[PDB]
Amino acid sequence: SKEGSVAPKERINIKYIPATGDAQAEVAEVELPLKTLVVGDFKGHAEQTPLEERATVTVDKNNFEAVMRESELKITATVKNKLTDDENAELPVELNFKSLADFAPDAVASQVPELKKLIELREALVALKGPLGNIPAFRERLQSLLNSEESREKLLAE
Amino acid sequence: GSLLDEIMAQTRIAPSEEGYDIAKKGVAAFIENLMGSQHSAEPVNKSLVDQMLVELDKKISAQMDEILHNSQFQAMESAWRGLKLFVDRTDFRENNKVEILHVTKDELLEDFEFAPETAQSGLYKHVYSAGYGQFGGEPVGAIIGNYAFTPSTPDMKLLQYMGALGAMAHAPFISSVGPEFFGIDSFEELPNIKDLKSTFESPKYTKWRSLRESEDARYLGLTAPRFLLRVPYDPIENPVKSFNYAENVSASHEHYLWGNTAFAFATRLTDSFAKYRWCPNIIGPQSGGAVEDLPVHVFESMGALQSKIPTEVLITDRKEFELAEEGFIALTMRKGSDNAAFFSANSIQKPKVFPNTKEGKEAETNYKLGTQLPYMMIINRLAHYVKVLQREQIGAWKERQDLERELNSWIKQYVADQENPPADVRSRRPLRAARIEVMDVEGNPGWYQVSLSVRPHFKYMGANFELSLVGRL
Amino acid sequence: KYTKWRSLRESEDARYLGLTAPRFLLRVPYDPIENPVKSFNYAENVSASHEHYLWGNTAFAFATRLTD
Numbered sequence: 001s002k003e004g005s006v007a008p009k010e011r012i013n014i015k016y017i018p019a020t021g022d023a024q025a026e027v028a029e030v031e032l033p034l035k036t037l038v039v040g041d042f043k044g045h046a047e048q049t050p051l052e053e054r055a056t057v058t059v060d061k062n063n064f065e066a067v068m069r070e071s072e073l074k075i076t077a078t079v080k081n082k083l084t085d086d087e088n089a090e091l092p093v094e095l096n097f098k099s100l101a102d103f104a105p106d107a108v109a110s111q112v113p114e115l116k117k118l119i120e121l122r123e124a125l126v127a128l129k130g131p132l133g134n135i136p137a138f139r140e141r142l143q144s145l146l147n148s149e150e151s152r153e154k155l156l157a158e
Numbered sequence: 159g160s161l162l163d164e165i166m167a168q169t170r171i172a173p174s175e176e177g178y179d180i181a182k183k184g185v186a187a188f189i190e191n192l193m194g195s196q197h198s199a200e201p202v203n204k205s206l207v208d209q210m211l212v213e214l215d216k217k218i219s220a221q222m223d224e225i226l227h228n229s230q231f232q233a234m235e236s237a238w239r240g241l242k243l244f245v246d247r248t249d250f251r252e253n254n255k256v257e258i259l260h261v262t263k264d265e266l267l268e269d270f271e272f273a274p275e276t277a278q279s280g281l282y283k284h285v286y287s288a289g290y291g292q293f294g295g296e297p298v299g300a301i302i303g304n305y306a307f308t309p310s311t312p313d314m315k316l317l318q319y320m321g322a323l324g325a326m327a328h329a330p331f332i333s334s335v336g337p338e339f340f341g342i343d344s345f346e347e348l349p350n351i352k353d354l355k356s357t358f359e360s361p362k363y364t365k366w367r368s369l370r371e372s373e374d375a376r377y378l379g380l381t382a383p384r385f386l387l388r389v390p391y392d393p394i395e396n397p398v399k400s401f402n403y404a405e406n407v408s409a410s411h412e413h414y415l416w417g418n419t420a421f422a423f424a425t426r427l428t429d430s431f432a433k434y435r436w437c438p439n440i441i442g443p444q445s446g447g448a449v450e451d452l453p454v455h456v457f458e459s460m461g462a463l464q465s466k467i468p469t470e471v472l473i474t475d476r477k478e479f480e481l482a483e484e485g486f487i488a489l490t491m492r493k494g495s496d497n498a499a500f501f502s503a504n505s506i507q508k509p510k511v512f513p514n515t516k517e518g519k520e521a522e523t524n525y526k527l528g529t530q531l532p533y534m535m536i537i538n539r540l541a542h543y544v545k546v547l548q549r550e551q552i553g554a555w556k557e558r559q560d561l562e563r564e565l566n567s568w569i570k571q572y573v574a575d576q577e578n579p580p581a582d583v584r585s586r587r588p589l590r591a592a593r594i595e596v597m598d599v600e601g602n603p604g605w606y607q608v609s610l611s612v613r614p615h616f617k618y619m620g621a622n623f624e625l626s627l628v629g630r631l
Numbered sequence: 632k633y634t635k636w637r638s639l640r641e642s643e644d645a646r647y648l649g650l651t652a653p654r655f656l657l658r659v660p661y662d663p664i665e666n667p668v669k670s671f672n673y674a675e676n677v678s679a680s681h682e683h684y685l686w687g688n689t690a691f692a693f694a695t696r697l698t699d
Contacts, residue, residue: 038241051272051284057258
């Protein structure tokens with residue numbers, strides 16, 4: 001960290017060392033944004049901490065998916081069971097919401113294990129419809145399964 | 159192993175490469191339901207698969223109209239998706255921020271019962287001291303109340319402690335009244351009310367008519383009926399991924415995701431600020447009080463094809479004017495479309511009748527301008543700017559003549575003392591005249607009782623149009 | 632291997648040191664049609680080794696732009 005210089009003399013000795021600079025820190029009167037405080041019940045319980053210790057979170061369009069994920073909106077309730085022939089049956093659920101698409105029935109039914117087997121039932125039926133009507137030899141062996149009733153029921157349990 | 163023979167004869171996925179475990183579950187599931195009606199034909203089976211999907215969707219969507227539409231779910235969906243309607247509309251690039259506070263409505267009155275004075279409460283910490291009462295901190299414009307107010311004592315004690323909080327931090331508390339506030343217990347019978355003035359002069363509302371007369375009620379607006387948030391889903395209009403979901407909405411209109419209109423009224427506080435950097439512009443169907451892009455739901459009525467009204471009642475013009483005199487920010491809906499409008503943002507304060515002197519007839523019109531609340535929001539900003547601007551100055555070398563000048567040369571960029579300026583000069587400069595009279599305090603010299611006396615422009619409300627014919631002229 | 636390089640770069644007097652380009656070509660190999668020689672036909676058989684081309688040093692060519 002030393003500039004190469006010459007021996008000093010009656011001749012003039014130019015050297016290059018860059019200087020510290022003068023900033024003179026510029027004024028900037030920033031203005032006040034119109035800040036609102038949305039207050040109200042945003043989760044499914046009553047928090048045990050008193051009000052003077054809990055915090056306010058700032059939400060804009062870019063971080064709304066992160067504020068919703070870190071809230072852990074866990075909605076646990078007992079709802080009516082309409083998956084069987086019982087009218088007086090009930091079925092509690094367990095919900096974990098991390099995005100705005102978790103309100104949609106694609107992700108609500110995916111978090112209910114009684115509905116994970118019904119979408120998997122439908123996905124197995126959409127898979128059937130493609131190769132069903134293309135090969136006309138499927139109905140030829142439906143009558144063979146109509147004939148072979150013993151070996152068919154042994155394979156349905158598997 | 160005949161099921162393996164059907165996979166190997168199926169030449170699309172025969173030699174156990176990919177998708178052979180899913181299609182094996184497809185064959186075995188269809189045979190278990192095939193015994194209800196024996197038939198052997200693939201194109202009828204292509205309908206019989208579909209006849210096992212329509213009966214399946216009757217099993218699933220009847221369950222997903224019960225996992226949804228629950229009082230714990232829907233009240234926590236409208237309180238959160240309605241926030242997304244407040245985040246998506248407000249332009250955060252145009253100097254806007256919004257704080258989110260988790261309270262519950264029963265906790266909040268206990269928190270005002272917690273402190274002996276409202277100036278030591280826990281909500282006073284988040285409204286005043288963490289925001290406005292803070293060096294450099296951004297101050298609070300308004301408080302959205304995501305509540306459903308009753309006229310009972312645990313909800314008139316809260317608003318008495320929110321009007322006093324709103325008079326300290328200079329921020330009006332906007333929330334909404336419920337159906338049970340009007341005494342109807344089911345909301346769509348509101349236009350059936352034939353006299354709403356006599357309803358409010360009932361002895362059930364003694365803690366309401368005493369709230370209205372109070373001085374700090376100026377910072378309390380209570381908003382509209384309600385508004386719609388989510389269109390119910392449909393396998394053609396708004397589908398879902400890998401599923402067909404027809405949300406069977408019954409005759410009960412409580413199953414629609416009805417939001418709270420303190421969200422939607424604060425949309426107009428902020429979309430007025432994102433355009434003109436002020437907020438008197440909240441009461442215009444073509445001038446900034448128009449809640450646009452509401453959800454609509456076209457369903458079949460008794461013969462005709464109508465639309466579900468996005469606010470739960472059709473507020474007439476006489477009903478809205480009777481709500482305007484009684485201190486309510488009502489939202490009339492543009493009947494037949496997806497728009498709505500505010501017309502008058504009057505706070506709950508009552509214009510006090512002053513005696514018929516020269517000053518009394520004057521000060522009655524002076525006190526009337528305080529209650530209306532677009533005009534509070536052009537002086538709440540003249541309490542948030544001036545608190546911040548005269549906070550930096552502490553410790554300077556100033557005078558009383560210098561104090562008069564740093565304020566008069568400041569607010570006269572907000573003053574357009576002009577009878578007819580253009581439509582942009584009126585809203586960028588919302589004031590019209592401003593008087594500042596700086597005085598002293600004797601005994602302890604150097605304490606300055608100044609009197610900033612602003613004056614606004616005046617909007618458009620009511621006329622007469624008394625038609626006739628002349629015949630010649 | 633470059634500890635005496637990354638310590639050269641941080642130094643103050645390294646400001647007066649530029650190190651130039653790959654290399655550049657100087658002489659087209661001769662041809663009895665294109666660039667002939669007097670009273671002789673010379674086809675310079677350039678092999679697959681590209682070291683036989685007259686490759687110059689680009690400190691010549693970068694100082695061409697200092698002077699032009």
